[PDB]
Design a protein around this ligand. Sequence first.
Ligand SMILES: Cc1c(-c2cc3cc(NC(=O)O[C@@H]4CCC[C@H]4C#N)ncc3c(N)c2F)cnc2c1NCCO2
Ligand code: NA
Length: 289
Amino acid sequence: PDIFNRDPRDHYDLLQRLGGGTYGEVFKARDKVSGDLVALKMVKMEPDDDVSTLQKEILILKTCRHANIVAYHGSYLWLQKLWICMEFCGAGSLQDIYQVTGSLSELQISYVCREVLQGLAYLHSQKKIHRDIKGANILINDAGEVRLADFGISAQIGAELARRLEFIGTPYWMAPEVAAVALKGGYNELCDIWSLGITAIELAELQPPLFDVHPLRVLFLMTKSGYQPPRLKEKGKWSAAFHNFIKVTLTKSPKKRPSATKMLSHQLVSQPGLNRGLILDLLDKLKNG
Ligand SMILES: Cc1c(-c2cc3cc(NC(=O)O[C@@H]4CCC[C@H]4C#N)ncc3c(N)c2F)cnc2c1NCCO2
Ligand code: NA
């Protein structure tokens, strides 16, 4: 798949770090030959990370023509550092957007949900889990397209697991079911459907439920037996279809939670008037008011 064995600095000038750490090491960069902007994500590579495995995963990323996946433009591999070259989004994430525009309309939220569900459907059909659906991780490109980033690669998933090791502590005395559970980390493909439901509330209310309470307390609230799925705050403002989308996306039991494909036949994401003009409107509002 032609992973270049060259310093990406050869071809690109780094301009600005993106995300303030939440995106790891991602940069807005300018191609030197053309004038074009890109996103360069830098995944640190361990010696253990096999370069052939990588090549398998990258080819998948390269051949993707899905409309709801951030586009792959290439990748470099220089001095134990992999770089992924993607499209750059002036408008950034839906979080960057609503922090200027304010809450999205129901129709805007409905569109974002349809497009993400399409992205999720694609990921899940490749036995991939996003694991981090949220406003911050949904990019709106210059054409008003809604896209998820696909980082289904071993070295990336590897770095997340490095964090989780510091979390779960030393493993040598751990039982195999404790090791298995800790690796998985409870993440299953339907976790993305729950995360989208929270996202829709985030898009509607400018923050996820319980965001005014400390993470530690919330972790305890969440894992109480009686914990209830959150709902939208202001009843009057939203249609029954939105409330329902939320009800069904935010099902507690994963055995009873609907998949991306089933959710694409929900009232909310099937309704007329869902077009990218909704997003273009949002973009004009961001950049003007
Ligand atoms: C979303 C993400 C990205 C990621 C972020 C991107 C951001 C932008 N654009 C951007 O941030 O724009 C500024 C924000 C507003 C002002 C703008 C100025 N300068 N454009 C393209 C991006 C892109 N292709 C990506 F893959 C990289 N790694 C990640 C995650 N999620 C979590 C896991 O790791
Ligand atoms: Na673009």
